Amino acid sequence: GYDRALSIFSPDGHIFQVEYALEAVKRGTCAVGVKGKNCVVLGCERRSTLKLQDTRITPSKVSKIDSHVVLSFSGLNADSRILIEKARVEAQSHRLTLEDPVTVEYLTRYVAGVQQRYTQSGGVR
Amino acid sequence: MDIILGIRVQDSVILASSKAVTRGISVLKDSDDKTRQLSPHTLMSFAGEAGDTVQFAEYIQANIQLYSIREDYELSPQAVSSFVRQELAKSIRSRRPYQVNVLIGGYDKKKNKPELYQIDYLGTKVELPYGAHGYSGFYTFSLLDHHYRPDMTTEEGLDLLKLCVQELEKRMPMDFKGVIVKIVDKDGIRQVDDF
Amino acid sequence: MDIILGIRVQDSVILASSKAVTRGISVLKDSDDKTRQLSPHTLMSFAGEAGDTVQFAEYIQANIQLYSIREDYELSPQAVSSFVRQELAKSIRSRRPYQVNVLIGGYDKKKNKPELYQIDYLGTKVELPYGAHGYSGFYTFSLLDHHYRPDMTTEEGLDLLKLCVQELEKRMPMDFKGVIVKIVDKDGIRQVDDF
Amino acid sequence: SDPSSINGGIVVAMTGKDCVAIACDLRLGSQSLGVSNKFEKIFHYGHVFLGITGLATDVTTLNEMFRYKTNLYKLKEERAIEPETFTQLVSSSLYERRFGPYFVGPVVAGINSKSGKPFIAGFDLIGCIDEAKDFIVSGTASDQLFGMCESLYEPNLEPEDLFETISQALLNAADRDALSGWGAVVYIIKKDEVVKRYLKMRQD
Amino acid sequence: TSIMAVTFKDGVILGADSRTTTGAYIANRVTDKLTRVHDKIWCCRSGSAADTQAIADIVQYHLELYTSQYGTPSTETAASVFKELCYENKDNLTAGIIVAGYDDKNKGEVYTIPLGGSVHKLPYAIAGSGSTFIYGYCDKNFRENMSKEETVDFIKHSLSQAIKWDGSSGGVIRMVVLTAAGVERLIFYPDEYEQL
Amino acid sequence: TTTLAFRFQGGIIVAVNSRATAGNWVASQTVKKVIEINPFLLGTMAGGAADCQFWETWLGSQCRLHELREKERISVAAASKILSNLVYQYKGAGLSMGTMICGYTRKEGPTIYYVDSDGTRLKGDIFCVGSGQTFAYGVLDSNYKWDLSVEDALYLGKRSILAAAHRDAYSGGSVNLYHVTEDGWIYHGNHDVGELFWKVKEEEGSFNNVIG
Amino acid sequence: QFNPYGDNGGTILGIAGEDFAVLAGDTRNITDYSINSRYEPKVFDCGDNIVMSANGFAADGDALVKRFKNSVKWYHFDHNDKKLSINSAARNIQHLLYGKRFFPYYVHTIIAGLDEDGKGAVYSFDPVGSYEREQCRAGGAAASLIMPFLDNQVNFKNQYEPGTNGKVKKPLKYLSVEEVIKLVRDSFTSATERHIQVGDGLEILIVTKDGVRKEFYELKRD
Amino acid sequence: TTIVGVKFNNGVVIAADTRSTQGPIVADKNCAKLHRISPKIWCAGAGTAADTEAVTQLIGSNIELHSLYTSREPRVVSALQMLKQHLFKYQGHIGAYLIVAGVDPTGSHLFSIHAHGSTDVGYYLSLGSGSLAAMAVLESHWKQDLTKEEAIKLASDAIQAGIWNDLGSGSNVDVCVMEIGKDAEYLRNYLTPNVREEKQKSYKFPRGTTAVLKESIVNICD
Amino acid sequence: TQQPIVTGTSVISMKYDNGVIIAADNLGSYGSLLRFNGVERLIPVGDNTVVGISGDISDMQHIERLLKDLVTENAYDNPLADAEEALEPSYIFEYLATVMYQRRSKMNPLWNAIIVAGVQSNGDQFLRYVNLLGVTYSSPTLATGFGAHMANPLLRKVVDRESDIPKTTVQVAEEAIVNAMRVLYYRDARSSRNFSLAIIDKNTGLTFKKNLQVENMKWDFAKDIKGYGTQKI
Numbered sequence A: 001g002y003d004r005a006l007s008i009f010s011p012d013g014h015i016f017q018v019e020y021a022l023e024a025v026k027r028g029t030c031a032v033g034v035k036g037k038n039c040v041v042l043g044c045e046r047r048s049t050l051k052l053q054d055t056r057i058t059p060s061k062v063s064k065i066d067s068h069v070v071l072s073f074s075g076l077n078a079d080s081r082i083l084i085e086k087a088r089v090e091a092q093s094h095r096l097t098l099e100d101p102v103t104v105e106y107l108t109r110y111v112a113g114v115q116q117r118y119t120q121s122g123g124v125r
Numbered sequence B, C: 001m002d003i004i005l006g007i008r009v010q011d012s013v014i015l016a017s018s019k020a021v022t023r024g025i026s027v028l029k030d031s032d033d034k035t036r037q038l039s040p041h042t043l044m045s046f047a048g049e050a051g052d053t054v055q056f057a058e059y060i061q062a063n064i065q066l067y068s069i070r071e072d073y074e075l076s077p078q079a080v081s082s083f084v085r086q087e088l089a090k091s092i093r094s095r096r097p098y099q100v101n102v103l104i105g106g107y108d109k110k111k112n113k114p115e116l117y118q119i120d121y122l123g124t125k126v127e128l129p130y131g132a133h134g135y136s137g138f139y140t141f142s143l144l145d146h147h148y149r150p151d152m153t154t155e156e157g158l159d160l161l162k163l164c165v166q167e168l169e170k171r172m173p174m175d176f177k178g179v180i181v182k183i184v185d186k187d188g189i190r191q192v193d194d195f
Numbered sequence D: 001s002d003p004s005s006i007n008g009g010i011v012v013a014m015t016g017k018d019c020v021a022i023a024c025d026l027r028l029g030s031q032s033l034g035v036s037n038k039f040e041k042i043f044h045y046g047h048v049f050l051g052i053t054g055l056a057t058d059v060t061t062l063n064e065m066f067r068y069k070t071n072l073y074k075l076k077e078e079r080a081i082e083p084e085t086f087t088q089l090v091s092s093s094l095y096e097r098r099f100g101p102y103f104v105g106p107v108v109a110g111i112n113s114k115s116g117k118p119f120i121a122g123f124d125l126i127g128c129i130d131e132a133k134d135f136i137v138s139g140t141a142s143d144q145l146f147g148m149c150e151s152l153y154e155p156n157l158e159p160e161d162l163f164e165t166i167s168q169a170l171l172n173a174a175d176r177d178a179l180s181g182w183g184a185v186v187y188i189i190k191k192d193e194v195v196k197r198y199l200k201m202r203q204d
Numbered sequence E: 001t002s003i004m005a006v007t008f009k010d011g012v013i014l015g016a017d018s019r020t021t022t023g024a025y026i027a028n029r030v031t032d033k034l035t036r037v038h039d040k041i042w043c044c045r046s047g048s049a050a051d052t053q054a055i056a057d058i059v060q061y062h063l064e065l066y067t068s069q070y071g072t073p074s075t076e077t078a079a080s081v082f083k084e085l086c087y088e089n090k091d092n093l094t095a096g097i098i099v100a101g102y103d104d105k106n107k108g109e110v111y112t113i114p115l116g117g118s119v120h121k122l123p124y125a126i127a128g129s130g131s132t133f134i135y136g137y138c139d140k141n142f143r144e145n146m147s148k149e150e151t152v153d154f155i156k157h158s159l160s161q162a163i164k165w166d167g168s169s170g171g172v173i174r175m176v177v178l179t180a181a182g183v184e185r186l187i188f189y190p191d192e193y194e195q196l
Numbered sequence F: 001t002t003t004l005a006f007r008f009q010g011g012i013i014v015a016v017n018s019r020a021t022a023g024n025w026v027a028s029q030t031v032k033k034v035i036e037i038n039p040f041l042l043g044t045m046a047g048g049a050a051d052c053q054f055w056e057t058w059l060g061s062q063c064r065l066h067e068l069r070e071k072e073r074i075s076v077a078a079a080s081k082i083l084s085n086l087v088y089q090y091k092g093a094g095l096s097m098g099t100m101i102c103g104y105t106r107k108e109g110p111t112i113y114y115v116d117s118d119g120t121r122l123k124g125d126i127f128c129v130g131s132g133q134t135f136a137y138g139v140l141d142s143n144y145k146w147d148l149s150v151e152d153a154l155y156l157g158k159r160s161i162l163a164a165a166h167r168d169a170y171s172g173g174s175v176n177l178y179h180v181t182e183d184g185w186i187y188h189g190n191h192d193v194g195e196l197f198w199k200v201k202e203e204e205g206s207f208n209n210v211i212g
Numbered sequence G: 001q002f003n004p005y006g007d008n009g010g011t012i013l014g015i016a017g018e019d020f021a022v023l024a025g026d027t028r029n030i031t032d033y034s035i036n037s038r039y040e041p042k043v044f045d046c047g048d049n050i051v052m053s054a055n056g057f058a059a060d061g062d063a064l065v066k067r068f069k070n071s072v073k074w075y076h077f078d079h080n081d082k083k084l085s086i087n088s089a090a091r092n093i094q095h096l097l098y099g100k101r102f103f104p105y106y107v108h109t110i111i112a113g114l115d116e117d118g119k120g121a122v123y124s125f126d127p128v129g130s131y132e133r134e135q136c137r138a139g140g141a142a143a144s145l146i147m148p149f150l151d152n153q154v155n156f157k158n159q160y161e162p163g164t165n166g167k168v169k170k171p172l173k174y175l176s177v178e179e180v181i182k183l184v185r186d187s188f189t190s191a192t193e194r195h196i197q198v199g200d201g202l203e204i205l206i207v208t209k210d211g212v213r214k215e216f217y218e219l220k221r222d
Numbered sequence H: 001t002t003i004v005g006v007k008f009n010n011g012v013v014i015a016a017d018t019r020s021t022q023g024p025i026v027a028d029k030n031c032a033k034l035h036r037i038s039p040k041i042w043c044a045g046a047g048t049a050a051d052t053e054a055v056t057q058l059i060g061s062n063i064e065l066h067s068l069y070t071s072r073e074p075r076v077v078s079a080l081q082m083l084k085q086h087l088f089k090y091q092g093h094i095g096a097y098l099i100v101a102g103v104d105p106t107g108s109h110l111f112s113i114h115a116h117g118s119t120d121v122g123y124y125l126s127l128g129s130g131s132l133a134a135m136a137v138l139e140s141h142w143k144q145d146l147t148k149e150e151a152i153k154l155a156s157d158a159i160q161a162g163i164w165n166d167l168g169s170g171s172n173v174d175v176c177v178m179e180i181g182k183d184a185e186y187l188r189n190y191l192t193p194n195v196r197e198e199k200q201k202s203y204k205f206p207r208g209t210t211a212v213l214k215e216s217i218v219n220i221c222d
Numbered sequence I: 001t002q003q004p005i006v007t008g009t010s011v012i013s014m015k016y017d018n019g020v021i022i023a024a025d026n027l028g029s030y031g032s033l034l035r036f037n038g039v040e041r042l043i044p045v046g047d048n049t050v051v052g053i054s055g056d057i058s059d060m061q062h063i064e065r066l067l068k069d070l071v072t073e074n075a076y077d078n079p080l081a082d083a084e085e086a087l088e089p090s091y092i093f094e095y096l097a098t099v100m101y102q103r104r105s106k107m108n109p110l111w112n113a114i115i116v117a118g119v120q121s122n123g124d125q126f127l128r129y130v131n132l133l134g135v136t137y138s139s140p141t142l143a144t145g146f147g148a149h150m151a152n153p154l155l156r157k158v159v160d161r162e163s164d165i166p167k168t169t170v171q172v173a174e175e176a177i178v179n180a181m182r183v184l185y186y187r188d189a190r191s192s193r194n195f196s197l198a199i200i201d202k203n204t205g206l207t208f209k210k211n212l213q214v215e216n217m218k219w220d221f222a223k224d225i226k227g228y229g230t231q232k233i
C-alpha cells in the first residue's frame, strides 16, 4: 500500500498540507449558517460563470444526512461527497445500535473525526 | 414467530402477523409486532429462527433508509423485494444463514398499485394476491382460493382476513395470541388497533 | 391429551381435563372427555400416548365394574388406586408399556372423605390435596401452593380451579380448548356444564 | 432417563449402643418438579425396618412384596423374621431379577430379638449385601452422606446422641442435593421401643 | 496364539506356544493349548479360550460316549464332531481348531477347522495369529514322511519364528507326539528356541 | 435459577434466587444473580454462570464508556442492545444466557428488556427467566396488578421466587430483592428461604402441602 | 479419537478465618486406577500473599497457575510494584479462564489470601470463570463428601440452639487457625477413607499478614 | 479388587483384599471376598460383587447336594466344572472372576475362572484390578517347593502390592489356608495395615441441636 | 488427531542415593507384529541427562532431533556451554513439557510418554514424567505403560518414599530395575528380551549400557502344567 506521510510538520510547527487544504476551502463558494430561535437556515452561494446548467439534477449544495440533520460545505466538491456518504452511513448505524437518531453534535464529532484521521494517516491527503 | 399472512386487494396490501413469542413451555409475550417499516409505503413482516428475524429485518430497514436519504427518493416495492431476495440468496450459502421468511407489502406510487411479495429464507421470491409462511398456508390458501376476489375493498379484505384468523384459531394446535393487522396503501402505513 | 388437573377439597374431589385432541397441525376435536367412571363414587381422568389412554382407562373400568357385580359392593378409592397402580407397575416392564398418566378422584363412603390419587405411567402413586400431570403442574402447583386451603368448599375449589385454567390459558403454548370439570362427592359424580 | 435419579431421595442407617437408627427424606419428584413431601421411604415388617431409595414405583412394589413374603414367613415359622434372615431374603429377591432389576438402594435396620445385637445392612440394585458395623447410606446424595457419616460418626452412641448424629448427617447431605429433602423422618430403635421423629429442614 | 500339527512317518505331532492374552497383557504364560479329546486324538486350540474349552469338553464327552457304544472312533469322526459344533454355532463362536490323531490303519492324520466351521484334511496345518509369519517358512521346509526328530525340529523352528514376530505368541513350545508307541509330551524353553 | 422482574405503578421490582447447580450437585446457595451495572441499571443472570457474569460485567464497561463519550447515561434500550448484538455474534457457539436488563431513564421511564443467548430481545412489563420460571409466573400472574403498592410489589416478587424455590429442585438458597425508581435502584436485602419459607407459611397460611 | 482431557484426581479445600485463610489439598496424583505420584503439590504460593490451586486436569491446572503467576509478575512491572489485591487477582483469573471459554481449562480453581481490610478471603472458580467469594469451599474429586461437612461445621448449617424449639440458629463466628486445621485434617481423612482418588499426603498453606506458612500431614496410602 | 492363589508343599493358599467400590466411592472397607464352596474348597472372587457371591453360593449348594448323593467329599474340579459351565452359558454377563482352590481325595488344586467361562491352572495366580501389581510380586518372589508359611507370606505380599498401588484395592488382607489332611483355616483380617487414625475432634452434638417437628411411638408388636 | 503406528512399550526408572537409573527395551512394535528389534529409546542429552521415550517411534525420532538441535543452539555464543551454562535435565524437561502441552492444545499431539532422568549441577537427582496430554509428575519411581502397573509396585518396595532414597544403593537399584524388566518380559505382550539401561551418577557420571538381556528366568514349572482343569495327561 501507499504509505507516504503527506501531512507532516514543518520547522515553524505548521502542517502545510492541512493549511493548503484550508486554501481550497477559501477558494470554494461561500456558505453561511444562521440559527434563529426555533430554526436554523443554511445559505449557499452558487457561482454564475456557469450558465446552461441543469438545476434539477445538479448536486445540491446542502445535503440531508438524516431526516433531521443537514450538511452544507465549502471547498472541493468531490471531497464533500465522501464525508457526506460516511456521515449518512454512521447516521443509520447509530439508529440501528442505539435505537435513536444521532444528535447534531455526535454527527459533527464523527465527521470531524474522519477529517482529522486524514491529517495523520499515511498515503492520504 | 409462527403466523404471518398477507392479502393484496384492489387499493391496498394487508399484513397480519401473530403476537405470540414462545420459548419452551412459556409464552413470553403476547403483543409482539413482527414487522418493520422499510419505507413510508413499504412494510415487511417476518417469521423464523429466534434472533435472526429481527436482526435481518432491521438490517434491511437500515439499508433501505440509507438509500432513501442518499437519493432523496423512495424505492419501489419491487426494487426493495429484489434487494431483500438477493440478501437472502447470499445468506443461504453463508457459514450461518439467516433462517427468516418474510412478506413484503408495499404500495407503488408510480404505478398506483398495491404489491405483495413472499420471500422464504432460501431467497425464493414470488408476487402473490395472498401469501403466508409456515403452517398457516396449509389452512389459509385453500380458504382464500375460495373466498378471495381481486377487486375487493380494504374492508372486504379485513373480513376475509378475519375468516382466516378464525380458522387458524380453530384448527391450529398452538395458541398464537391473535394478530396485529397493518394496512399499506397510497396514504402510507397504518395499524388496525381493534382486531 | 395434555392437561389434567385434580383438586381435593373438604367434601369433594374436582377433576378438570382439557377438551382438545390434537394430531399433527390439526385440532381434530375440542369436546373430548378424558375421563371414565370406574364406580358410582370413583372417577379416573387420564392423559398420555394416543390409543393407550382410552384402552387402559376402559380396561380398568371393566375390571372395577366386574368386581362391583361379583361382590355387590363398591371398592374404596384407595383400593381402586392400588389396583390401577399395580396394573401400571406390571405394564412398565412389559414388551410395550401403557404410556398413560392418571388421576383418580373418589369419595370414600365408609370414611366420608374425598380422596385424590396421582399415578404416572411408571406406577408411581401419591395421594395429594391437588395434583396434575404433564406440563400443567409447572404452573398450577405453585399457584395452588399459594391459594389452596384444606377446608375449602366445592364452590371455592371451582374458583381456585378457574384461576389455574386462566393461568394455563395465558402462559401455555398450545391451545387446549378449555376443560371439562367433574365433581366427585357423597352423592356420586356430576359434571359442571358451564365452565 | 436414569431410573435411580428421577424421583430422588435418601436413606441412612446407623448403629449405636444397644440401638439402631434409620432415617430418610420425604421428597418425591419428577426430575426438577417436586411432587410430594409426604413420601416416606422407610417401612417395617414386625421389628425389622427397611428403607428403600431409588425409583419410587419399585420402592412401593418392593414394600408390598416384602410385606407379602414376611407375612407368609410368620404364618409358617410362627415367629417374626429377624434382620439377618430378612437381609438374605432381600438379597435373594433382588438377584432373582438380575437381568431386569428393581432400581433401588435398600437398607435394612433392626435389632435381633434373640441376641439383642444391633444390625444394619445395605444392598445394590441386584442384591449384593453390604454389611456394616457403623453406617449404611443410600440415595442421590450418597456421596454427601458418606462424607457426613464418616466424619460425624463415632461408635457406641446412646439413642439420644445417635439421634442428633444421624439427623445432622441426613440434613446437611440433603441440603447439598437438589433431588433430596422436603422433610425428613428418623426412626430410633431400641430393643422394645421405637421412636419416630419428623425433622424440621429447609423446604427448597 | 501359534499352533501347528504335522504328520510324519511314525504318526503325527502337535505343537503350540503357551501364551494367553487379554489385550497386551499376558494372562497366562504357561498355557496348555494341546488338549486330549481321546487316547490318541488331540487338538490344538486357537481363538477364544472359553469357546475352545467348551467345545473340546463337549467333543471329549461325545467321543467317550461313542467309545462306550461303538469302540474307538476315527480321527475323521472326531474332526466331524468339532466341525458340527463349530459350524452350527458359527455366529457365537471364535474358535480355530486343529484336530490330530493316530489310527493304526490310517496312521497320522491332521484336520484343520477354521472360523467358518469348514473341515480341511492336510499333511500339516498351521493356525493362530502367529501362523501368518511362517506360511513361507513352513511351505519351503515341510516334507512328507519325515522322521520324528526332523518333525520336532520343523515344528520347533517354525513356532520359534512365529513367537519371534507375533506379540500374541510366546512362552514355551509344547509338543505332543502321537504314534503306535503311545503318547509323548515334549516341552522347549525360550533359552533353547529363541537362539535358533 | 429463577429470576423475575416486573413493571408497576411505583417503578420496577427485581427478584432472584441464589442457587448454582452442576447437574444435581448444589454448588452454591449464595450467588449474586443481579449485577449492578450503574445506579440506574440492573442485569439479571440465568443460564451459564460464567457467560452471564462475564458478559454483564463487560456490559457495564461498555455502558461506562458510553457516558464518558456522550456525557449522558445510556438508555436501557441501548444497553440491552449492546448485549443482544454481542451474544448474536456468538450465536451457535454455545453461550447460555437468559438475562433481563432493568432500569430507569428520563426519556424511557421504567423499562425492562429480556435478552437471551439465541439473540432474542424483548421489551415487556413482566418476565420470569430460569429453570423455575413457570412456578414464579404462576404466583406472579395470579396476584399481579398495576396498582400494587411498593410494599405489596416487593412481597409479590419475593413470594414468587419462594414459590419456585420450593417446587423447582434447581432453585433455592435465598431471595435478593431490588426496587428501581426514578431516583435509581434500591437494594431490599437478602432473604434466606430456610427461614422465609416457614415465616411465610405461618403468617400467610399457605403451603398446606408441606408437613407443618 | 484423541481426547485432550484427563482426570488426575485429587481434592482441595479452602477456608477463610478472621485474619487468616487456608488452602489445603492432597498430594496424590492419579490416572484411572494407577498412582502417578504420592507427593505432587498442587497448592502454590503465587506472590502478594495469594495462594492458588487448580484441581482437575493437572496439565490445565499447571498451565493456569503458571499464567497467573506470570500475570502477577507483569502487574508489578506495569503498575509500579503495586500489590495485587485478592479481589483483583480473582477478576484477572476470571479473564484467564473465560479466555478459553470454547476450549476450557478442566479445573476447579480456588485462591485464598487476605482482602484489603486484612480479613481472610477465599475465592472459587468454575472451569470457565464464574467466581464467588466464600468463607468455605471444597473442590475436586471428593468435594461432594467434604462440602456438606463444612456447611455443618464452619457455617453451622442445620444447627439450632438447644432448647429453643429450633427457633434460634447457632450463631455464626470466626474459627481459630487451630480449629480450622482440625476440620481440614478430619475432612481429608474422611475423604481418604471413602474416596479412592484421595490419600497419600495432605499439604496445607496458611496465609496471614506475616506471610505464607506450610504444614504437611500423612494420609493413608491405599 | 486384588485376589491371589498360591500353591505350596502340602496344600494351597488364597488371599484377597477387602475393598468394595461403587464408582470412585468405597462402599465397604471390610468386605469378605473369600467364599466357602465346601468345607475344604474355597473361592476368591473379583468383578461384579453380587455375581461372585450368587454363583459361588449356587455351586456351593449343588456341591453339597452332590456330596450327599455320592457319599464322597467334593472335588475342586467338580466346582470348577460346574462354575465354568454356568458362566459360559451366560456369555460373560455374569461378571464373576474367581480363583478356586481346595483340597480333596485327589490332592490340592488351584484354578482361576473368568466371566466368559475359561479356566486356567497354575502354581500362582492373580485376578482383579490389582492383579498386575500382585503378579509382579508373584513373578519376582515365587519359587517351587514353598512351605506353608512362605506361601502365606508371598500371598499376603501380593495382596499388599494391590492394596498400596491399585486404587481399586485397599484396607485389609484376608487369607484361607487349605492344607492336605487338615481342616481349612479361614484367617479373616489376617493383616490390618490400614487402620484409621484418631480424629482431631469429636463431632458429638449437644442434645437438642436438631430441630424437631413431631414425635410418636411406633408399634412393632402385634 | 493421530494414531500411533510403530510403538515402544514401557520405560522404567527410579532414584537412588547418588543418582537415577532408567531403562527401556529395544523394541519397535507394529501392532501385534514385533517389527523392529534394534531401536534405542534412551537418548542421552549431554553427560548428565537421559530422556527415555515410549509411544510412537516417528514422534520419538522427531524429539531426538529437537534435543540434538537444543544442544547445538545452547552452544551458540556460549563460552560456558560445557560448564556453568550447560544444559540441565530441568531445562530439557521443561522444554519438552512445553512442546507436549502446546501440541495437545493444537489437537495434534506427539503420541508419547517421556521420562527425563538426570542429575542437576548441584548434585540433585532429577526424575520427571510428561506425556502426550502435557501432564507432568515426579516421583521416586516413574514408569510408563505396563511398567506403571507392574514395575512401579516392585520399585516402590525399594523406594516407597523420599526418605528411602539415601538408603538405596546403585547396586540395589539396578537389581530392582533389571528384575522389573524381566517381569515385563513375562507379562507384557509387546516387550522384548533385549534392552538398554542408563545410570546417571553425580560422581561417576553417565554410564550407558547397551545390549542387555533378561536372564535367570523361571520356565521349568511349565512342564508340570497339563490341560486347563481335569486333564491328567
Ligand SMILES: *[C@@](C)(CO)[C@](*)(O)[C@H](CC(C)C)NC(=O)[C@H](Cc1ccccc1)NC(=O)[C@H](CC(C)C)NC(=O)[C@H](CCc1ccccc1)NC(=O)CN1CCOCC1
Binding pocket: E001, E002, E019, E020, E021, E022, E023, E027, E031, E033, E045, E046, E047, E048, E049, E050, E052, E094, E128, E129, E130, E168, E169, H114, H116, H118
Ligand atoms: C492367540 C493369542 C491368538 O490367536 C491364541 O489364539 C490364544 C488361544 C489360547 C489361549 C486358547 N487366544 C487367547 O489367548 C484369547 C485371545 C482372544 C481374545 C479375545 C477374543 C478371542 C480371542 N484370549 C482370551 O480368550 C482371553 C482369556 C482370558 C484372559 C482368560 N479372554 C479375553 O480376552 C476376554 C475375551 C472375551 C471375548 C470377547 C469376544 C469374543 C470372545 C471372547 N476378554 C476379557 O476378559 C475382557 N477384555 C478386557 C479388555 O478389553 C477387551 C476384553
Ligand SMILES: *[C@@](C)(CO)[C@](*)(O)[C@H](CC(C)C)NC(=O)[C@H](Cc1ccccc1)NC(=O)[C@H](CC(C)C)NC(=O)[C@H](CCc1ccccc1)NC(=O)CN1CCOCC1
Binding pocket: F001, F002, F019, F020, F021, F022, F023, F027, F028, F031, F033, F045, F046, F047, F048, F049, F050, F052, F096, F130, F131, F170, F171, G101, G104, G125, G126, G127, G128, G130
Ligand atoms: C439455576 C440455578 C440453574 O439453572 C440458574 O440457571 C443458574 C444461573 C446462575 C448460577 C448464574 N445456572 C446455573 O447454576 C448453571 C447451570 C448450568 C450448568 C452448566 C452449563 C450451563 C448451565 N451452572 C453453572 O453454570 C455452573 C456454575 C458453577 C456451579 C459455579 N458451572 C458449571 O456447571 C461448570 C461450567 C459449565 C460450563 C458451561 C459452558 C462450557 C463449559 C462448562 N461445569 C462444571 O463445574 C463441570 N463439573 C462440575 C462437577 O465438577 C466436575 C466438573
Ligand SMILES: *[C@@](C)(CO)[C@](*)(O)[C@H](CC(C)C)NC(=O)[C@H](Cc1ccccc1)NC(=O)[C@H](CC(C)C)NC(=O)[C@H](CCc1ccccc1)NC(=O)CN1CCOCC1
Binding pocket: D004, D054, D103, D104, D105, D123, D124, D125, D126, D128, D129, D130, H001, H002, H019, H020, H021, H022, H023, H027, H031, H033, H045, H046, H047, H048, H049, H050, H052, H095, H128, H129, H168, H169
Ligand atoms: C475390585 C474392587 C474391583 O475390581 C473388586 O473386584 C471388587 C470385588 C468384590 C467386592 C466382589 N469389585 C467390586 O467392588 C465391584 C466393582 C464393580 C462395580 C461395578 C460393576 C462391576 C464391578 N463393585 C460392585 O459390584 C458394587 C458392589 C456394591 C457397592 C455393593 N456394585 C455396584 O457398584 C453396582 C453395580 C451393579 C451392576 C449391575 C449390572 C452389571 C454390573 C454391575 N452399581 C450400583 O449399584 C450403581 N448404582 C447405585 C445406585 O443404584 C443404581 C446403580
Ligand SMILES: [Cl-]
Binding pocket: E020, E031, E032, E033, E049, E053, H119, I228
Ligand atoms: Cl486355554
Ligand SMILES: [Mg+2]
Binding pocket: D174, D175, D176, D177, D178, D179, D180, D181, D182, D204
Ligand atoms: Mg435440596
Ligand SMILES: [Mg+2]
Binding pocket: E163, E164, E165, E166, E167, E168, E169, E170
Ligand atoms: Mg512373542
Ligand SMILES: [Mg+2]
Binding pocket: D203, D204, F164, F165, F166, F167, F168, F169, F170, F171, F172
Ligand atoms: Mg427447590
Ligand SMILES: [Mg+2]
Binding pocket: G191, G192, G193, G194, G195, G196, G197, G198, G199, G220, G222
Ligand atoms: Mg483412598
